[PDB]
Amino acid sequence: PQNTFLENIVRRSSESSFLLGNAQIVDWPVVYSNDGFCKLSGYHRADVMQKSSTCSFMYGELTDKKTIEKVRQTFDNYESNCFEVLLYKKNRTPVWFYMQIAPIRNEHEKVVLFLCTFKDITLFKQPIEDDSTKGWTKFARLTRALTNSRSVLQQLTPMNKTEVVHKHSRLAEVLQLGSDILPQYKQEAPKTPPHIILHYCAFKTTWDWVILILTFYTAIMVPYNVSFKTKQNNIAWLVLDSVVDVIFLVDIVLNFHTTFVGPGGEVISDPKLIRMNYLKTWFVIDLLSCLFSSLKVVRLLRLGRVARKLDHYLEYGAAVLVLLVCVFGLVAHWLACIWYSIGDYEVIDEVTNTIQIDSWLYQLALSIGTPYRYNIWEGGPSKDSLYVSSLYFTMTSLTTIGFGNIAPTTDVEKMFSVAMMMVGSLLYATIFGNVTTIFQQMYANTNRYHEMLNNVRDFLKLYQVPKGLSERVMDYIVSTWSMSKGIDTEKVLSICPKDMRADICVHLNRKVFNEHPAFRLASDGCLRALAVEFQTIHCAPGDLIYHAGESVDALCFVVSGSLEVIQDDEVVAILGKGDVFGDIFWKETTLAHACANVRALTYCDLHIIKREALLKVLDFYTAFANSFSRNLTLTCNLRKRIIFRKISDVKKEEEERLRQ
Amino acid sequence: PQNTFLENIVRRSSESSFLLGNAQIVDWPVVYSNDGFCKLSGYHRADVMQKSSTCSFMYGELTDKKTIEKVRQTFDNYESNCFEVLLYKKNRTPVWFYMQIAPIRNEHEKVVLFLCTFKDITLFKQPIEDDSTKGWTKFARLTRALTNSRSVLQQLTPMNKTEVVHKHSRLAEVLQLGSDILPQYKQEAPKTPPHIILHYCAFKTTWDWVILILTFYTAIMVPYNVSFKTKQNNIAWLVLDSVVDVIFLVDIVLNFHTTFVGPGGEVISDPKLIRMNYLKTWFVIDLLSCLFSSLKVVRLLRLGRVARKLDHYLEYGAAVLVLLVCVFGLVAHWLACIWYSIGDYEVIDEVTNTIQIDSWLYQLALSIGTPYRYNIWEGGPSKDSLYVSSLYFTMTSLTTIGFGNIAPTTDVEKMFSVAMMMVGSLLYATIFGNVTTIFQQMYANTNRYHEMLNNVRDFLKLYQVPKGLSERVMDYIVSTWSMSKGIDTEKVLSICPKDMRADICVHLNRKVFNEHPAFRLASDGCLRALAVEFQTIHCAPGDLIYHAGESVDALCFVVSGSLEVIQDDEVVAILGKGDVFGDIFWKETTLAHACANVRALTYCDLHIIKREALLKVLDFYTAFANSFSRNLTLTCNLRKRIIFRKISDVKKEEEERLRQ
Ligand SMILES: [K+]
Ligand SMILES: [K+]
Ligand SMILES: [K+]
């Protein structure tokens, strides 16, 4: 919902007369005399500063030939004019107009709320008032006493060695208007400049997960290529690397054409702000990562890219667990690469020509079976075996299992082992604490329900409650949790605003408003004033709703279940669905008591509205009380005692009368 | 804020007359006739015991030549006098004065609140009242009927074989006054005696972290030097050891000149208390640690020093994690030193001359490659390899990984291993439980926000709320958490005092007081009486604030957003920023209803003040109500219906009138 005349005009616009009009009986809204009419050009609000689309009441002079129907007619023409009518101004002069015209129709197809951006002048023609005629008071001071459209572009004398150039905001401003103004009626939603995409569309979503997948691929492939020195025979990987690099470069380019949330939580949409913000925030790192061994470790920063985007991901529970297991695998892989690099460095001393029998590649070669042979040193474990052994060792070390068939024995490997031990201990602790908490986050609610059940059971056992009452209490608790699964309405309604709470309650009833032929002629005033008062109740079988222990003070509505109005051990009516039972409240102003013993056959759901909160609303909306009185029929009028009389035992009464 | 005359005079001062005065119209404050004028020397409060800087009203005698303007003039002289005026005393005699004078001016430069420490006498000259003239009643009993400055130093007869020595509190007490009295006006803050430093300055902070760093250094270096027997060739370490020792000794000396918080939570500042407290509390341990193998284990007590200072550190989250990892490293290092000591003890039996093939140094030597050789037993693993192996083993044992390439096999090592196992299990459990809790302490708040979101989402899903209402509720919750991130104002305002709460609220408004030209002529009374009543509201787009469902009873102020006052499907005014809309309350004393349908264009923030809590304050401060009435202009007076009339359809009404 937007009338498209205020939201984004306080930044770029200038002096204008954004006439709206409403077009039923006489004048309504001219509204925006914005950007310069503060307290120095016209009236203030409640005047033609804010209404009377065709302006008046600021006249202050006589009705001359030009001062009647020239632009006063133009205001409701909407199309085009160039004449000169009078509208009073601070200059104390017979004001006439130089202006520009611009139409636009509607979205609702009503020929209302046009654009009509106007300028108005007083100076450029003539002052001829004799209020001050002391030489240069109105014949040369005219260039001083105007505070109008002149003060937008050309705030100097109208001559100023210039004839038509200074006519750009009074005579030739129509080229700066039209499509440069917001529309006359549209729909309010986050809108973007041309060739700009929002950050929550179906395009940026797919690219976010695509970039995440490619980053997860690079974080795996780059350390492997750096440590386990590979080859280039397969040109397939050589071209997929270029494909991924160019995809990331295209994403860097496309990041200029997106939207980001700023201070306060609103979608910012303007090319210059987007560009400079993205630049200053991430362009250095993005360029460094996009474009010899150290170059790949620099290239790894696309993982920090996903780290910055992490706020978009997560918060969904299962995704957190998947991310945690993925990062555990990633750190295991990185430690495997470092471990293999160390193991390859240690074997084969280059000072002499000998193989160091300590390392871990020599022990692995001895255990597997394939040894190192000299012919300069070639022949040993295959690359797949080396990688799988490195991963297996680092997984033994991270998971704190520890086997010992692959263990550090040299000097460098022990230092690296203690470093890995500290790092892995920290990561293990944090990661699996988070995993356990995430897994317990829902069994927390389940255990809340179980704790409620256990507390009720313990209370029933401790005080030695009989079997029937205990089983009824258990059944009621089970049913109430079944239809109210953990969710509590009071808090959710408390954290919402007043109007939104009223709307939520109105939709919560949904079966006593559009189902009962009484609440029909109420659009949005009575429905949102009564629903805040209706309260839903659930009643167990055998419960006495309005037995002879309470007075009738609530117009109860039945929406699900069945009730029988027991009167002296027997039933006079059996209420079903959509049958209101209760006392008349709006036309007696009295009180009575329970004329019956209303029970509940099955589990029932009723909608109580209190008496004092019922007739007040219909008294406020007097047009609704008439329909309410004329369209409500009480199925069981629990106000008057009925003449209740039972079939087949006055027979023996008459028999005894004839006998006695 | 301190007038410097009560805070610290009840411990050292004596009889005095600490005259203040206030100097505008007539008398005000002489105030402190402290330390002896309880109920036995003069009047009580509300008299020249507390006001009338120039004293009077305690006369009780006739106006003699000396009894008019001698010291009664001295009180406002402030400079010097030695004369004798009358001021009535319990002696029932024509009192005259022996006194001492002392001036001091101000801090605010006003020549007010001088020092004027006076003494007053009655005895030393003469009693000549004939009330009791029964011999030794006023000529010899004079030495009994005085209860004044005599009762401070020389409480005996004025003769007492002494002439001028007994004149030390009536004639020669000026040398015990002056700079020995607190000032006349200063600023209140924790102050220290000369050559005393506070415990939260920028000096003791740097020394606290310096001592912490040096203690962390010693706790690492001392066990290493004790176990791995080092040398002295590098004189560099030999001089850094002396430098650190002398630094710690200087710190022990400097601890005499610091301040410590005592009982109740106040900064104690007095050399004797500081000295004796520090001595009795820590001097034994500090001296023992400051100043052959056992001497270093004693020297290790500087770690207990940091343990005592620990309260200063910690409580910052990240510092807790850093401290925990540091102590884990420290215990690993200590266990490494003990393990190497055991391993060095076991190898090479001294009864025979043989090497024990069990230990762990022999197995390590066999695995590494360098064996033990005999020529008495020399040659083996280097010192760096020995230390790194010891650390690696103890880190395998503490982190509960366990590899087995270095494992206990002798008799002593198994007992030490089980002891280390129990100790490491305890330390592991406590340390990493604390680490996990500290890490979860902030994701607790994040998970509270996520739980609120999940509860709202579940409530919306369960009851099948339509799309528009659900999305509006989600947006409102997101915005409210965005600008109110976890922080709840009610609790923080509850735990604060009343005046501080009022000040916090006054600063919380900050945009309806110093921005609106109405709340200008109110210094501190009306602002702190109205801000406790103002409540801020946030309204979502499309919300109806004061539609035709409520009566106008609140002078709402707009500080951010925009509102349009819809009247019969169309708008008569569009409120902006700093535009108050509401009913007049202080000059009609009536009630009306919503003459409009005020909506909210964008997200808005308003400042409601209730009617009954508004005019009461301005009624209390009658000088403020005049300015409030004369300086408030309602932008949208939602009290009176305006004559609203719409432009361009009476045209067809007149057309039909001419047609029908
Ligand atoms: K093992
Ligand atoms: K283990
Ligand atoms: K083993």
Pairwise CB contact (< 8 Å): B435 & A429: yes
Does an H or E element contain A606, and which?
strand A604-608
User: B496 with A520: CB under 8 angstroms?
Assistant: no
The answer for residues whose C-beta is within 8 angstroms of residue B158's C-beta and 6 or more apart is B123, B124, B143, B166
User: Whole-angstrom Cα distance, residue A234 to residue A1?
Assistant: 59
Strand bridging mode A599-600 / A604-608: unpaired
User: Whole-angstrom Cα distance, residue A14 to residue A118?
Assistant: 11
Count of alpha carbons within 13 angstroms of residue B487, beta-carbon side = 7
Does an H or E element contain B320, and which?
helix B318-346
Between the two ends of chain A, the Cα-to-Cα distance in Å is 87
User: B631 with B520: CB under 8 angstroms?
Assistant: yes
**Integer CA distances (angstroms), A239 to A207, A242, A244, B386, B631, in order:** 21, 5, 9, 50, 76
DSSP secondary structure letter of residue B163: S
Token pair 């005349």 is found at A5
| Residue of A573, A562, A576 lying closest to A596 (CA atoms) | A573
**Integer CA distances (angstroms), A43 to A39, A87, A348, B575, in order:** 7, 11, 95, 16
**Torsion of the alpha carbons at B61, B62, B65 and B67, rounded to the nearest 10:** 30
Among candidates B388, B482, B602 on the partner chain, residue whose Cβ is nearest the Cβ of A411: B388
Long-range contacts of B10-16 (CB under 8 A, 24+ apart): B13/B181, B14/B152, B14/B169, B15/B119, B15/B148, B15/B149, B15/B151, B15/B152, B15/B169, B16/B117, B16/B118, B16/B119
Q: Residue B409, class by beta-carbon neighbours within 10 Å (0-12 exposed, 13-18 middle, 19+ buried)?
A: middle
Within 10 angstroms of residue B509's Cβ, the number of other Cβ atoms is 19
User: A199 with A309: CB under 8 angstroms?
Assistant: no
User: Whole-angstrom Cα distance, residue B487 to residue B445?
Assistant: 10
B374/chain A closest Cα distance in angstroms: 24
Pairwise CB contact (< 8 Å): B645 & A6: no
A135: left (phi over 0), alpha (psi -120 to 50) or beta: left
Tokens encoding A375: 């012919």
Pairwise CB contact (< 8 Å): A421 & B540: no
Tokens encoding A26: 């006489």
Strand bridging mode B563-567 / A570-575: unpaired
User: Whole-angstrom Cα distance, residue B153 to residue B167?
Assistant: 9
What are residue B605's phi and psi, to 5 degrees? -125, 115
User: A128 with A138: CB under 8 angstroms?
Assistant: yes
User: Whole-angstrom Cα distance, residue A44 to residue A26?
Assistant: 20
Amino acid at B613: A
Q: What is the DSSP string of B236-271?
A: HHHHHHHHHHHHHHHHHHHGGG--EE-TTS-EE--H
| Cα B168 from chain centre | 44
Q: How far is the CA of B335 from the centre of ligand 2 (A)?
A: 19
User: Whole-angstrom Cα distance, residue B544 to residue B552?
Assistant: 13
> Technique behind this structure?
cryo-EM
| Residue of B409, B396, B391, B370 lying closest to A407 (CA atoms) | B396
| Residue of B423, B429, B420 lying closest to B394 (CA atoms) | B420
B562 chain-A contacts, CB cut-off 8 A:
6
Strand bridging mode A599-600 / B260-261: unpaired
**Integer CA distances (angstroms), B142 to A611, B135, B139, B168, B227, in order:** 90, 12, 6, 20, 85
- Breaks in chain A (C to N > 2.5 A) come right after 291, 375
User: Whole-angstrom Cα distance, residue A204 to residue A199?
Assistant: 6
User: Whole-angstrom Cα distance, residue A347 to residue A432?
Assistant: 36
A28 chain-B contacts, CB cut-off 8 A:
570, 572, 644-647
Amino acid at B563: L
B228/chain A closest Cα distance in angstroms: 18
User: A443 with A329: CB under 8 angstroms?
Assistant: no
| Cα B654 from chain centre | 78
What are residue B325's phi and psi, to 5 degrees? -65, -35
User: Whole-angstrom Cα distance, residue A72 to residue A52?
Assistant: 10
A4: left (phi over 0), alpha (psi -120 to 50) or beta: left
Mutation pick from A8, A73, A498 vs chain B, by most beta carbons of B within 10 Å, is A498
Tokens encoding B503: 């000040």
User: Whole-angstrom Cα distance, residue A394 to residue A347?
Assistant: 19
Positive or negative: CA dihedral A634, A635, A636, A641: positive
Tokens encoding B375: 């020529």
The answer for residues whose C-beta is within 8 angstroms of residue B128's C-beta and 6 or more apart is B93, B94, B138
Amino acid at B590: T
DSSP secondary structure letter of residue A32: B
Positive or negative: CA dihedral B582, B583, B586, B592: negative
Q: Is B76 annotated as a binding residue?
A: no
User: B99 with B54: CB under 8 angstroms?
Assistant: no
Does an H or E element contain A565, and which?
strand A563-567
Tell me the angle at which helices B302-309 and B202-227 cross, rounded to the nearest 10 degrees. Answer: 140
Strand bridging mode A599-600 / A563-567: antiparallel
Partnered with residue A581 across adjacent β-strands are: A556, A636
Does an H or E element contain B564, and which?
strand B563-567
Positive or negative: CA dihedral B457, B463, B467, B471: negative
Q: What is the DSSP string of B385-405?
A: HHHHHHHHHHHHHHTT---SS
**Integer CA distances (angstroms), A599 to A81, A375, A473, B423, in order:** 79, 102, 18, 69
Tell me the angle at which helices B383-398 and B318-346 cross, rounded to the nearest 10 degrees. Answer: 120
User: B283 with B253: CB under 8 angstroms?
Assistant: no
3-state helix/strand/coil string of B124-161: CCCCCCCCCCCCCCCCCHHHCCCCCHHHCCCCCCCCCC
| Residue of A414, A390, A394 lying closest to A331 (CA atoms) | A394
Q: For chain A, state the CA radius of gyration.
A: 42
Long-range contacts of A431-440 (CB under 8 A, 24+ apart): A431/A324, A431/A327, A431/A328, A433/B436, A433/B439, A433/B440, A434/A320, A434/A324, A434/B443, A435/A321, A435/A324, A437/B440, A437/B443, A437/B447, A438/A317, A438/A320, A438/A321, A439/A321
Pairwise CB contact (< 8 Å): A487 & B395: no
Sequence-ordered alpha helix ranges (H) in A369-466: 383-398, 411-462
Among candidates B385, B450, B647 on the partner chain, residue whose Cβ is nearest the Cβ of A23: B647
User: A289 with A298: CB under 8 angstroms?
Assistant: yes
Q: What is the DSSP string of B3-28?
A: -SSSTT-TTT--S--B-----SSS--
The answer for residues whose C-beta is within 8 angstroms of residue A94's C-beta and 6 or more apart is A61, A64, A67, A86, A127, A128, A129
Tokens encoding B168: 């030390």
Q: What is the DSSP string of B448-511?
A: HHHHHHHHHHHHHHHTT--HHHHHHHHHHHHHHHHHS-S--HHHHHHTS-HHHHHHHHHHHH-S
Token pair 């910055």 is found at A308
User: A613 with A533: CB under 8 angstroms?
Assistant: yes
Amino acid at B243: V
Tokens encoding B228: 């791995």
| Cα A197 from chain centre | 18
3-state helix/strand/coil string of B29-95: CCCECCCCCCCCCCCCCCCCCCCCCCCCCCCCCCCCCCCCCCCCCHHHHCCCCCCCCCCCCCCCCCC
User: Whole-angstrom Cα distance, residue B24 to residue A522?
Assistant: 72
User: Whole-angstrom Cα distance, residue A337 to residue A329?
Assistant: 12
A100/chain B closest Cα distance in angstroms: 21
Does an H or E element contain B340, and which?
helix B318-346
A482/chain B closest Cα distance in angstroms: 12
Q: What is the DSSP string of A227-268?
A: HTT--SS-HHHHHHHHHHHHHHHHHHHHGGG--EE-TTS-EE
Positive or negative: CA dihedral B218, B221, B227, B233: negative
Positive or negative: CA dihedral B294, B298, B300, B304: positive
Tell me the angle at which helices B318-346 and B361-368 cross, rounded to the nearest 10 degrees. Answer: 90
3-state helix/strand/coil string of B627-638: HHHHHCCCCECC
User: Whole-angstrom Cα distance, residue A649 to residue A655?
Assistant: 10
B278: left (phi over 0), alpha (psi -120 to 50) or beta: alpha
User: Whole-angstrom Cα distance, residue A43 to residue A37?
Assistant: 8
Sequence-ordered alpha helix ranges (H) in A347-410: 361-368, 383-398
Q: What is the DSSP string of A507-548?
A: HHH-SSSSSSTTTTS-SSSSHHHHTTT-EEEEE-TT--SS-T
Q: How far is the CA of B450 from the centre of ligand 2 (A)?
A: 36
User: A556 with A582: CB under 8 angstroms?
Assistant: yes
Tokens encoding A69: 């129907």
What CATH number is associated with residue A576? Answer: 2.60.120.10
Between the two ends of chain B, the Cα-to-Cα distance in Å is 87
User: Whole-angstrom Cα distance, residue A342 to residue B204?
Assistant: 46
Q: Residue B18, class by beta-carbon neighbours within 10 Å (0-12 exposed, 13-18 middle, 19+ buried)?
A: buried
User: Whole-angstrom Cα distance, residue A382 to residue A368?
Assistant: 11
User: B305 with B215: CB under 8 angstroms?
Assistant: yes
User: Whole-angstrom Cα distance, residue A55 to residue A69?
Assistant: 11
Sequence-ordered alpha helix ranges (H) in A257-407: 271-278, 284-290, 293-299, 302-309, 318-346, 361-368, 383-398
Domain that holds residue B548: 489-637
Among candidates A51, A415, A422 on the partner chain, residue whose Cβ is nearest the Cβ of B388: A415
Token pair 């707009």 is found at B558
**Integer CA distances (angstroms), B527 to B494, B534, B536, B559, B611, in order:** 19, 11, 16, 17, 16
3-class secondary-structure state, position B594 = coil
Pairwise CB contact (< 8 Å): A528 & B549: yes
User: Whole-angstrom Cα distance, residue A525 to residue B548?
Assistant: 8
Within 10 angstroms of residue A27's Cβ, the number of other Cβ atoms is 25
Positive or negative: CA dihedral A235, A241, A247, A250: negative
**Integer CA distances (angstroms), B584 to B545, B548, B558, in order:** 18, 18, 16
3-class secondary-structure state, position A2 = strand
Tokens encoding A131: 């209020």
User: Whole-angstrom Cα distance, residue A224 to residue A230?
Assistant: 8
Pairwise CB contact (< 8 Å): A425 & B432: yes
